[PDB]
Structures are given as C-alpha cells and as structure tokens.
Symmetry: C3
Subunit: 292 residues, 3 copies
Amino acid sequence: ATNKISGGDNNTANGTYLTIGGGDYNKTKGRYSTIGGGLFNEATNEYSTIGSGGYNKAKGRYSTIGGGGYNEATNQYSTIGGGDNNTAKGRYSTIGGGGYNEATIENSTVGGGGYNQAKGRNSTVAGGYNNEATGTDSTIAGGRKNQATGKGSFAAGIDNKANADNAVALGNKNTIEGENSVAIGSNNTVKKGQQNVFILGSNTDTTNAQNGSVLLGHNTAGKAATIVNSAEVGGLSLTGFAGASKTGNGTVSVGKKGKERQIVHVGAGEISDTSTDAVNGSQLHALATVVA
Amino acid sequence: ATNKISGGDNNTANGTYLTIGGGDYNKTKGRYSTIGGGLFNEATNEYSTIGSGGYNKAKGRYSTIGGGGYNEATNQYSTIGGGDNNTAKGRYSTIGGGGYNEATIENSTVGGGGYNQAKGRNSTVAGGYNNEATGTDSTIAGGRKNQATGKGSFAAGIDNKANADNAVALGNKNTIEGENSVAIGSNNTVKKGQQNVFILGSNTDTTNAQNGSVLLGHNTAGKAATIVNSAEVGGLSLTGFAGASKTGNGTVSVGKKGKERQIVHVGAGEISDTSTDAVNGSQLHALATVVA
Amino acid sequence: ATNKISGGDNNTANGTYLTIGGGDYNKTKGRYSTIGGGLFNEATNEYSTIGSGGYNKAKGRYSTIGGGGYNEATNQYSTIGGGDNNTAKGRYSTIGGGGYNEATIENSTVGGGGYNQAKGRNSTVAGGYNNEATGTDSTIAGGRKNQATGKGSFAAGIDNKANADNAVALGNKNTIEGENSVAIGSNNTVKKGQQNVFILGSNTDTTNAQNGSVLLGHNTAGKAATIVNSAEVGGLSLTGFAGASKTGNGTVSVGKKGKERQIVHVGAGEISDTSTDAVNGSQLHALATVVA
C-alpha cells in the first residue's frame, strides 16, 4: 500500500514505493521504481526509471530510459535517452538516442546514430552509422563503418580500422593492424607486423614498407632500407658515407617508381664527412661549376 | 475514459491511454502519450514522452523530450535530453541537451553545446559552439565555428571547413574544398580543384600547389613540379636523371623562398643512374674530396 | 491547491503547480516543477524536471535529470540524462550519463563515461575515462586520461595533453605546451616556448628542436638549424649556396644520430645557383661519371 499505480487495468506493481503514472500493461518490481506512462514498460530493480514510450525495459539498479521504444537498460546506472531498440548493459553505460545502438561494458558511451557499438571499457562512439569500438579506451568520433578494436585507438570518417594499440585512422579506408601506427588520408593499409608506420597520404602501397617507415602523399610506395657505405663509378670509389645505418629503420617515401616527387625549399646542408644533412641543387651546382 | 489526466483546469486529452501527471495547459493527443507535468507541453502521436519543463512539443511517433524549455521532437524515435530551443526533426535523431541545436535528418546527433547543426544523414556534432555538419557521415568532434559539408568529412578545433569528400580539417582555420585532402595545423587552404593535397603545417601558401602536393611546416609554400631530365653548367651537360616524372604529381615542400628548411638525419642514398634516393652532405663531400 | 503531490507521507511541495508522481521523501519548490517518483529527489526553481531515481537535485531554471542517482543539475537549461554522481552546473550544460562527470560552464558537454570534466566554455568530452577539457572551445574525442587546457585544443587516445592554443594531440602520450603545435603518434613532447612544431612520429627527442621544426617517424630527433653559405674541402672552396636562411626556421628531421633514414622516390631537382630543390642519387652519379 506504499505504491501509486493508476491508469490501466493491466498495470502491475510488485514491491515498495513503486509508481505508474498511467497507460497500460506496465510492470514495476523492486523498490522506488517509476514508469511515467505508456505501454508495456518494465521497470524492475531499485530506483529505476522509465519516462514513457513503449516496450522499454529498465532492469538494473538506477537505470534510466527517457522514452522511445524497445530500449533495454540493464546493469547499474545505465542510461538510454530514447530512440529505437537501444541496449545499454554495461555499468554506467550511456546511449543518447538513435536506433539499434549498444553500450555493453563499464563506462561505454554511444552519443546516437544507428547500429553503433561501444563494446570496450571506457569506449566511445559519438554518433554516425555502423561504428564499432571494441578496444579499451577506444574512440570513434563519427562517420560510417569504422572499427576501433585497438587499445586506446582512434577512428573517424568512412570505413576505417584502428585495429592495433594506439592506432590512429583518419579519413577514408585507413586500415591499421600494426602497433603504434598512424594513417591519415585515404586507402592506406598497415598490416600486422608492420610497426611504427606513419602515413599522411592516399592510395599508398605498403607492401615493401619496413617497420619505422613514413609515407607521404598520394600514390606513395614504401621501400626497403639499403645500407650504402660506399659507391663505385667506373673504377672510381667513393667511401665514408654517413648515415649508412645498420638498423632497419625503414625509409621516408615521397612517391613511387615512375611517379617521384621533388622536395622543394630545402636549405643548404652541411658538407662534411659526418654530414647527414640533405643537399640542394645549388650545392651540387657549386661543385659542377668547379668541374669546368 | 482510458486517460489519466490530473493537475490543472486546462490540461486536455484527445485520445486513448494518455497521461498528464500535473501542471497546467498541457495537451495530449494520439495513443499512449505522456506528460509528467510542467507547463504548455504538447505530446501528440503514438507513444511520445515529455518529462516536464515548459513549452515542449513531442509530436512524432516514439518521441522523447526529457525536460527543459521550447524543445521540439518531431519524427520517429526523436530524442531531446533537455535544454533550450532544441529541434530534433530527423528519424532516430538525437540532441543530448544544450541550446538552439538542430538534428534534422536520419541518425543525426548533437551531443550538446550551443547552435550546433547536424543536417547530414548519419552526421554528428559531439558538442561545442556553432558547428555545422551537413555531409552524409560527416563529423565535428567539437570546438567552435566548424563546418563539415563533405561526405564523410571530419573537423575539430576553431573555424575549420572540411567541405569536400573525405576532408580532414584539424586545428585552427583549416579550409578544405578539394577532394581527398587533409589539413592539420593552422591557417591552411585547399581550394576546389586542388585534389589529394596534404598539409601538416601552419600559415601555408597553397597558391602554386598542384594536385598531389604535400606541405610540411610553419610558413611553407607550394611549388609547381618541374621536369628535370638534364642540366647544363658552363658547356658541361649532365644527362640521364632519374625521377624526371612526366606526370604532374606536385612537390613535397618544407619551406618557402627565403625561409627554406634543412632536412636532417638523412641516410646515404644509392648512387646509381636509376637512383631516386635523396643524397646527404657526406656523399657530396666524398665527391668533392676527389675534386682536390 | 494547484499542486498534485501523491505517494508518500514525506513528499513535500512549496510552490505552485508542482507535481510528485509518487515514491517518498521528494521535495518540490518554485513553479511548474516535477518529480516522477523515486526517493529523496529535490526539484526546485521554475520548470525543473526529475524523471525518478534517488537523491537527485534539479535546482536551477529548466533543469532536467532523467534518472539515476546523486545527480545535480544546477543553473539554467542543465541536463543530466542519468547515471551516478554527475554534476551539470553550467548554463546549457549537458551530461549524457555515466559516473562522476562534470559539465561546469556555459555550453559544456559530457557524452558519458567516467570522471570526465568539461570545464571550458563550449568544451566537449564525448566519453571515455578521466578526461579533462579546460580550454574555451576545447575537445576530447574520447580515450583515457587526456587533457585539453588550450583554447580550441583537441585531444584523443591515452594520456595526451593538448595544453596550448590550437594544440592537436592524437594517440598515446603526446604532450603539447607550445603554441600552434601538433603531435600525432606516441611519446612526443612540445614544451612551452617551442612554437609551430609538427610531429608525425613516436618516441621523438625534441630537446634541440627550434621553433618551426617538423619531426617525422619513430625515434626521430630535432636539430638546430645551421647557416651554410659555403664549404671548404681541402683548399677548395664552394660558395654561393641557396637556402642558407638567416631566420631560425628549424629543420625537418627524419631520424636521429646513428638511426638515420633514407628518403626515397625523390624526383630530380633543378641544378642551378638558386636551386633549393633536393638532389637524388642519379644526379650525383651523373656528376661522378664525369669525374672519370
């Protein structure tokens, strides 16, 4: 006799200090739970809340469904703002609204949009469509058809995969499955076992890119690092080159075979036997002048 | 006689299983709609919800307004968490809260903040102020005065325009209106018809940057690619250069005229007639040594 | 006698057109405020709203708390969707849900997650864990333990500090405290007084990087710019170098001492006395051929 249920013949209460504002076929269980009205809403557990709408289920302690239809807030401190067929079943999980979204682990959030999944702990999908953040601390800023399965990974745009730890995939069709790698632009792939690779470009060819490679530009291809201590030009040998690195660091690429790029506005580099500064045309000219 | 309306003399119901918790001047229409209380709230259609507040309008099926004032949730599965003068009129559209925000198409989302507009399908504005995402699958992460009119474009910071397809504008005053281009930093412009341009820099001059150009650094200027098959130094001709590309790929720029940059820690490149590897100072020194 | 309070012996109303749907120990003050039910909820001021739950406080005009526990919406047009111990005390501030989140200034937003703080005007934290956006127009896209104290700054991933104006920190452990700088990758530091520095790389050494420096790649180190007008190789002097810039622009770095990187697919640059185009191996070979 502590409950305030009113409205319909089929509104049922099974507990203490429950309230149903009206509508019909609404169930309440537990203690201090509330349904504002609507149709076929279930608010069980302690201190749960359903604003209204239809076929919503707020099981779990301190759950909240603002309204809409077919939403399910399960688990402690869940929140669904509203929308269609949203499922917040993580602790402190949040779905702002939209359709068919899932926030399934502790502190996961979905801002809205459609068919988004925040499945990682502390993962976030701000909005967009068909985005899937699975890694711990992963983020999808928005867009469509992104994946962020990496720990603390970040993805935004269309069809990206930030699918290794600390992966950054920005733009369109960037696939990252190698640790600590970045791809910004379009159509870029960093495969598993290609580590520390950085791409600011589009339509790159990363077949031959070793670990540590940097790729810049449209149509740029990776290349294996070669050790060059010396060279021979028709009997004449040139020895003592600096930067003939033993380690496999990879190479900074600015184009591909047949589609090379000029590097412009380069300052004059040191000319000495230990110098690893790049050389510009005026410096080579200077020497060629003497060869007259 | 299936309705539960109570509270004020001016609360009106026109339908089946409607509920008004209290307050005054609240209207309900349709079936299974609910107003918790407050003032001048309109909940029409089937299964709509208004928590409370004032002058809110939840027309449209399965609409939800949590509270606040002057909010309008129109169209199926709309959600407004609360706030001032928010308009969610897209299907499954969402506005978390804030003031004067608009989510107008299917699956669009506004997290909060002020004067934000998610007008593209699957578009997202997480928050901030005066941000406008118009493209399909476009994203504005936050900040102030951003635009994302491009399909699957991405913008964040202050005063950016990701206004071409797959455009990435990050930081302050990056304007992109050329396809598949990226600008990260400050004060960068990629105009319409400048395609595949990548800028990691600030205050760049892109007047002379052709398609495919890469600009790195503060004050960096673009430059037109030149074909250089050979050169002549005082009667002496040097022929057979590799990388004298016929195609217009653009050029990687690291500075501007008068403010050139050295490129440092460059590994020794191949010295052969097909070599497109960059050359360091020790390599030029090596040859100069022989010229003694 | 304009109020509709029902449910418990300890539900109190002190104002006009207030409503309490049920539960117990709920307080209402002001005009047109509403509590759906629950336990120990306080809805004061004009047009405030509490859906239900426990120990929630909606002071402030047009406030909204959807549900959950221990939430406090203070100040005009505040919104808390639900969750645990959230505090929205800015004008038009928004918290989607989650636990222990704070939106404290005008137009600030927290999408969800845990221990997030939007303390800057127009600031946004989409979600994640322990993120702190303090700057005006600052953004944290998501992830864990980020800071964005800079005006219009942007951070995402794990443990970043976008802590200067227009700072972009993307990935893991990027620290930016220098004006208009960008760090994308892992373990990068831009200190106060290092301006206009751009890093696309990881584990960089920025001790010797001057203003305007660009660092590319894993393990890349900055280097001070040197003026090189001429050089001397065993009595032979080479004068008239172009790009011997007087200004301190900094240098583009591609590696570090002992771990240098080759730059590959470089187009042939102009060979003239004003040429600042980079030189490739085939061009140096061409000259070496003549030295036979």
